[PDB]
Amino acid sequence: AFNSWLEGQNLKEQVKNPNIEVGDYSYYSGFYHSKTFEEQAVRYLLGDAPTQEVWESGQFGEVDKLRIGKFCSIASGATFMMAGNQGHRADWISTFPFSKKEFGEGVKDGFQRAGDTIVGNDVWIGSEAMIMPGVHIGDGAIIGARAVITKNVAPYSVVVGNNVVVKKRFDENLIQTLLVIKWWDWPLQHIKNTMEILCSGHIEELEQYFIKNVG
Amino acid sequence: AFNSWLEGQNLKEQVKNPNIEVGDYSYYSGFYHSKTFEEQAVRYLLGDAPTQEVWESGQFGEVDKLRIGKFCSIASGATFMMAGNQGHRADWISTFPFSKKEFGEGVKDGFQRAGDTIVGNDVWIGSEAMIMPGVHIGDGAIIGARAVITKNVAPYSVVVGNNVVVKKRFDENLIQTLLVIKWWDWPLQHIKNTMEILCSGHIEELEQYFIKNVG
Amino acid sequence: AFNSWLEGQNLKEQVKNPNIEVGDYSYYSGFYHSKTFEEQAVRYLLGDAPTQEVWESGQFGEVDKLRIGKFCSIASGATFMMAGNQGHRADWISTFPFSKKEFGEGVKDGFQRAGDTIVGNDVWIGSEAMIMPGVHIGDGAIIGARAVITKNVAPYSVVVGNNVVVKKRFDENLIQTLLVIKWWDWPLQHIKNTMEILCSGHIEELEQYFIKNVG
Ligand SMILES: [Cl-]
Ligand SMILES: [Cl-]
Ligand SMILES: [Cl-]
Ligand SMILES: [Cl-]
Ligand SMILES: [Cl-]
Ligand SMILES: [Mg+2]
Ligand SMILES: [Mg+2]
Ligand SMILES: [Mg+2]
Numbered sequence: 001a002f003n004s005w006l007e008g009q010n011l012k013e014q015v016k017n018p019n020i021e022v023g024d025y026s027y028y029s030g031f032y033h034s035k036t037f038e039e040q041a042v043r044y045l046l047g048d049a050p051t052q053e054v055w056e057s058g059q060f061g062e063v064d065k066l067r068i069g070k071f072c073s074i075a076s077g078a079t080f081m082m083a084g085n086q087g088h089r090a091d092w093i094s095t096f097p098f099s100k101k102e103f104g105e106g107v108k109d110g111f112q113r114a115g116d117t118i119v120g121n122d123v124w125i126g127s128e129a130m131i132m133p134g135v136h137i138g139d140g141a142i143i144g145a146r147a148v149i150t151k152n153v154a155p156y157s158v159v160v161g162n163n164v165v166v167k168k169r170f171d172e173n174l175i176q177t178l179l180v181i182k183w184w185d186w187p188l189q190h191i192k193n194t195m196e197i198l199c200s201g202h203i204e205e206l207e208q209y210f211i212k213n214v215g
Numbered sequence: 216a217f218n219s220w221l222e223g224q225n226l227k228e229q230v231k232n233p234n235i236e237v238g239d240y241s242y243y244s245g246f247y248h249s250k251t252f253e254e255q256a257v258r259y260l261l262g263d264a265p266t267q268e269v270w271e272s273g274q275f276g277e278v279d280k281l282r283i284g285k286f287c288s289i290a291s292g293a294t295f296m297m298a299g300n301q302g303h304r305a306d307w308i309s310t311f312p313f314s315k316k317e318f319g320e321g322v323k324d325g326f327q328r329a330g331d332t333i334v335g336n337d338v339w340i341g342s343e344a345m346i347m348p349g350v351h352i353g354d355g356a357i358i359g360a361r362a363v364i365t366k367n368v369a370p371y372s373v374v375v376g377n378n379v380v381v382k383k384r385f386d387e388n389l390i391q392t393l394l395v396i397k398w399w400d401w402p403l404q405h406i407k408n409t410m411e412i413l414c415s416g417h418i419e420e421l422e423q424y425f426i427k428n429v430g
Numbered sequence: 431a432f433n434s435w436l437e438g439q440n441l442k443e444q445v446k447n448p449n450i451e452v453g454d455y456s457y458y459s460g461f462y463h464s465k466t467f468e469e470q471a472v473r474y475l476l477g478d479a480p481t482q483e484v485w486e487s488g489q490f491g492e493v494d495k496l497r498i499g500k501f502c503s504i505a506s507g508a509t510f511m512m513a514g515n516q517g518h519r520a521d522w523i524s525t526f527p528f529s530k531k532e533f534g535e536g537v538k539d540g541f542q543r544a545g546d547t548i549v550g551n552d553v554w555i556g557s558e559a560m561i562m563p564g565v566h567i568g569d570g571a572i573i574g575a576r577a578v579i580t581k582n583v584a585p586y587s588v589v590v591g592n593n594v595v596v597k598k599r600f601d602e603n604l605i606q607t608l609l610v611i612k613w614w615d616w617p618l619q620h621i622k623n624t625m626e627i628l629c630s631g632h633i634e635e636l637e638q639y640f641i642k643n644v645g
Contacts, residue, residue, distance in 0.1 A: 004480035005473070025526070031480070032473050043220070043247055043291075043342075050219040050246070071526045073518060076473075081342070081360070088288060088339050090357055090373065090384055093393065093421060094413045095339040096240070096286040104407050108414035124518055124525040127473075127511070128560075130343070130361055142520055145511070146560055146578050148361050148376070158520065161578070161592040162376040169520055178523065192534035198524050199538035206523060258435070258462055258557075265434035265461070296557070296575065303503060303554050305572055305588065305599055308608070308628045308636060310554040311455070311501040321625035345558075345576055363576050363591070377591045 002031035005076070011037055011068070017047040019063055023070030023121065023184075030076040032127075041074065042066060044083035064113050064133065069121035070184045075145070077128035084114040084133050120155060121184040139179060140169065155179060174203040181210040190214055220246035220291070226283070229253075232262040234278065238285030238336065238399070245291045247342075256289065257281060259298035279328050279348060284336030285399045290360065292343035299329040299348045335370065336399040355384060355393060370394060389418040396425040405429055432461035435506070441467055441498065447477040449493055453500030453551065453614075460506040462557075471504065472496060474513035494543050494563065499551035500614040505575070507558030514544035514563050550585065551614040570599060570608060585609060604633040611640040620644055 002009070008027040015022055015038055028037040038048060046063045047055040054060070066080055087097035089110040098107045114134030119125075123137055126145035137143070138155030148162045156175045158166040168175060183191065183198065183206060190213060191198070197206045217224070223242035230237055230253055243252040253263055261270045261278045269275075281295055302312040304325040315322045329349030334340075338352055341360030352358070353370030363377050371384045371393070383390065398406065398413065398421065405428060406413070412421045432439075438457035445452055447468055458467040468478055476485040476493050484490070496510055517527035519540035528537045544564030549555075553567055556575035567573070568585030578592050586605045588596040598605065613621065613628065613636060620643065621628070627635045 004484075006481060006484065025532075032470070040247070051221070054219075054221070071524060073526060075516075086290075089414075091416050092414055093398070093416070093418060094286065094337050095355075095357060096288055096337055098410060098413075102240075103410055106407070106410035106414075108411065110414065122524050122526060124520075132360075140525075142525060145562070162379075164592075183523070192536070195528060195534050195536035196538065198528070199519075199522055199536070199540065201521055201523065203523060255462070266436060269434070269436065304629075306631050308613070308630065308633060309501060309552050310570075310572065311503055311552060313625065313628070318625050319622045321622070321629075323626065323629035325629065347575070365590075377594075 001034055001036060002029075005029065005031035007031055009037065011074075014038075017042070017045060019045055019047045019065040021065060021067040023068060023072065025070055026068055026072035026074070028074040028078075030074075030078075032076045037074070041078055042080050042082065044081065044086065046083075062113075064116050066117045066119075068119040069123065069139070071122045072119060073124045075125060075127035075129070078125045078143075079128075079130040080117055081131060081133055082117065084112060085110070087111045121182075139182075139184075140175075142169070170201075170203065177203060177207050181207060181215065183210075186210075186214055216249060216251050217244075217246040220244065222246060224252065226252055226287075226289075232257070232260060232281075234260055234262045234280040235283075236280065237283040238287070240285055241283055241287035241289070243289040243293070245289075245293075247291045252289075256293055257295050257297065259296065259301060261298070277328070280331045282331060283334040284338065284354065286336055287334060287338045287340070289340045290342035290344075293340045293358075294343075294345040295332060296345060296347050297332070298326075300325070300327055302326045336397075354397075354399075355390070357384070385416075385418065392418055392422050396422055396429070398425075401425075401429055431464065432459075435459065435461040437461070438503075439467065441504075444468075447472070447475065449475055449477040449495045450498075451495065452498040453502070455500055456498055456502035456504070458504045458508075460504075462506040467504075471508055472510050472512065474511065474516065476513075492543075495546045497546055497548045499549060499553065499569065501552050502549060503554040505555060505557035505559075508555045508561070508573075509559070510547055510561045511563050512547065513541075515540070515542050517541045551612070569612075569614075570605070572599070600631075600633065607633055607637050611637060611644075613640070616640075616644055 008029045011022040011026050011028055033040050064082055087110040088095045100107050117135055119137045120139035122140045125143040129143050129147045132150045135149050136152040138153055140156035141153045142158045144160040150163050153159055156169045160166055194209050223244040226237040226241045226243055248255050302325045303310045313322045332350050334352045335354035337355050340358045344358050344362045346364045350364055352368040355371035356368045357373045359375030362375055365378055368374055371390045373381045375381055409421055409424050438459035441452040441456050441458055442454055463470050494512055517540045518525045530537045547565055549567045550569035552570045555573040559573045559577045562580045565579050567583040570586035571583045572588045574590030577590050580593050583589050586599045590596055624639055
């Protein structure tokens, strides 16, 4: 797994679940939680080891998948909760998932999909954070450690605690310029050339390089 | 212990501690935390294996017990903190638990009981939630994931985060109905007959069943 | 390891990292998380085992240290985040730690020290609490279970949740008295004699003893 906490495992090369969509360079640094990204960070997703056979038989059908963009930093212990409500329905008299074996016919399947969990590009997710099912995280967003995300996260927003939005990393205009140029989609050599600008707050410099050289 | 995350260990089968009392059909689905319910979920409860020979000595006083109702759904990582204050006294000059062997006979024992933590029936406890000592949880309540419950939970209420009370599952009249009919105490065949109403929101239909069949 | 949750490993006798200072009698009780104080509780601090070879080479120079006082109680899962920002810079266009091997030499290191994490004396840190980098915790303070401390904690204050200050343990003048007498620094004999007073809320008697015999 991880020999040290200075280690960062590339995700697109490793993940095998046909329901986890990762981008380039995105990594999971989970040394202090031992297990890999697919058996510790992604939870209750059909198409894994302990669940592979059940997924290949096609018993449950289509699933909610996890999509992660490029240049994402996923810290140790971060958790992506899938499988939606897992059969529990608060609007029903009972939240207990009765089984047809023990309780016969008339058992209505309470499961209902919550939608795909989508993580944008250049997203930093803090250690031991937890994402709820069906949550969209915009590009450039930052998730604090031990945060519990229940709602969609605006791009370049910073969210702490139990879905407390602190601030946006930049002015709204500059945020929209970054959302238009999309440096993460650039060819590698352009990113290598503009790395000095990327290691800075000078957004409009990056925009000028984009207009002159990329777009 | 757990071979998959669609597995749920029935609790009243496999719990050995005389200080735990769990009702029928209540399960714990703890795949993503490996160990069993008594090893991971219940913590600092005198009578488990690592303290057995010390607890059978009777040197400690009476301790608070854990009682869980029936048809409870305990997700992975949920935790029931026991042992009260564990000897730490915030009202004392020092919260450090001095040992008699190291600091002499003048050591006063600071442990104080908190009361039995009691969980009702048809209670859904989210993943990695943590219940503090002395807490009663009403029937039909829902505890959100990663929630920290420090106060008593009203029946059929939904509590998230740091004991933030979101709402109640139904109108108070219908919750009174559910509280007086108590479908969890019914014989099994009546539950099998009313399964399709239990998988619905029509409470007064179920109450008509209780009136005309159960008593 | 940990035989039971009733035992707590003495930290001063055990800690090997040179970047960690810990006072007398302070213990770590971490049975419900298995591994030692230095592998589970202290995270992302060079000098431990998996990074020892990196620390001996002087590759990253000086680093933030962890300083723990005397008579501290650290429960299982209490985690101290080190390594500051880990190269992630919210102020820059990208929070991604680009590597000089994969990208151009124009990569600028975004790591930043957060200052030493300092825990005072007579501190009780609840189970699975998280202490962010650079946090100072005053003497006699109490951290609640699963609390996330991101600011400095005043001496003899109770902090639960996400840096929610509940109250202070005693009156301000008595807190001052404790902060001036500092019983934890006394010769162990005087602590032994005072044991009946420390196991109480009688700060005045402790001050009288200090005036008569210690000061
Ligand atoms: Cl990271
Ligand atoms: Cl189901
Ligand atoms: Cl690319
Ligand atoms: Cl569940
Ligand atoms: Cl403790
Ligand atoms: Mg510039
Ligand atoms: Mg109906
Ligand atoms: Mg006295």
